[PDB]
Design a protein around this ligand. Structure first.
Ligand SMILES: Nc1nc2c(ncn2[C@@H]2O[C@H](COP(=O)(O)OP(=O)(O)NP(=O)(O)O)[C@@H](O)[C@H]2O)c(=O)[nH]1
Ligand SMILES: [Mg+2]
Length: 155
C-alpha cells in the first residue's frame, strides 16, 4: 500500500468538504457542520497500485505532497483567490513545481460566472491540469483526486 498525502485548499464555500465527502462516502450533503472532520483516509487501487490516500480538507501543507486547489464556477471571487493559494503553496514548498490540480467545482449549476476557458488559461500558466467537478452529481470527482495522484507520480 502506497500512501499519498493530498491537501484540499480554496475559498470558503467552494465545496472542498463536499468533494472530499463525495470521494469518501459517494454521498452529497447540502450542508456541512462547521465542526466536520478535516482528516480522511481512503484505500483505492489507482492504475493497478493499492493506495492509501491521506486527505486534509482545509478551512476556507508543509506535509502535503499534492494540492487540490478548488474554486466554484459560480463564485468569481473564489477563482480570483486561486492566485493567493498558489502563492502560498509556492512559498511553503519554495518551488513553482508542485503537484497541483486546479478544480472548478459546482459544475451542475446553471449560469456559471467563471468560464472553462478562463480556468484552463490559469492552469496553463501554472503548468497544471484543470478539471471541472460536481460534488453533487459526482462528475469529475474521481478524475480530480486521481489526477492529483498521477501528478505526484510524475514528480
Ligand atoms: N450544487 C452544488 N452545491 C455544492 C457543490 N459542492 C458543494 N456544494 C454546496 O456548497 C456549500 C458549501 O459546501 P462545502 O463543502 O461546505 O464547502 P467548503 O469549501 O468545504 N467550505 P469551508 O471552507 O467553509 O469548509 C454547501 O451548501 C454544499 O452543499 C456542488 O458541486 N454543487
Ligand atoms: Mg469545508
Amino acid at each position: 500500500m502506497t500512501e499519498y498525502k493530498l491537501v484540499v485548499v480554496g475559498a470558503g464555500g467552494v465545496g472542498k468538504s463536499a468533494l472530499t465527502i463525495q470521494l469518501i462516502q459517494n454521498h452529497f450533503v447540502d450542508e456541512y457542520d462547521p465542526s466536520i472532520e478535516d482528516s480522511y483516509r481512503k484505500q483505492v487501487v489507482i492504475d493497478g497500485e493499492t493506495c492509501l490516500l491521506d486527505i486534509l480538507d482545509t478551512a476556507g501543507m508543509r506535509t502535503g505532497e499534492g494540492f487540490l486547489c478548488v474554486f466554484a464556477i459560480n463564485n468569481t471571487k473564489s477563482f480570483e483567490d486561486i492566485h493567493q493559494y498558489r502563492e502560498q503553496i509556492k512559498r511553503v514548498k519554495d518551488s513553482d513545481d508542485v503537484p497541483m490540480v486546479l478544480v472548478g467545482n459546482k459544475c451542475d449549476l446553471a449560469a456559471r460566472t467563471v468560464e472553462s476557458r478562463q480556468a484552463q488559461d490559469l492552469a496553463r500558466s501554472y503548468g497544471i491540469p484543470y478539471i471541472e467537478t460536481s460534488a453533487k452529481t459526482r462528475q469529475g470527482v474521481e478524475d480530480a483526486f486521481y489526477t492529483l495522484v498521477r501528478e505526484i507520480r510524475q514528480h
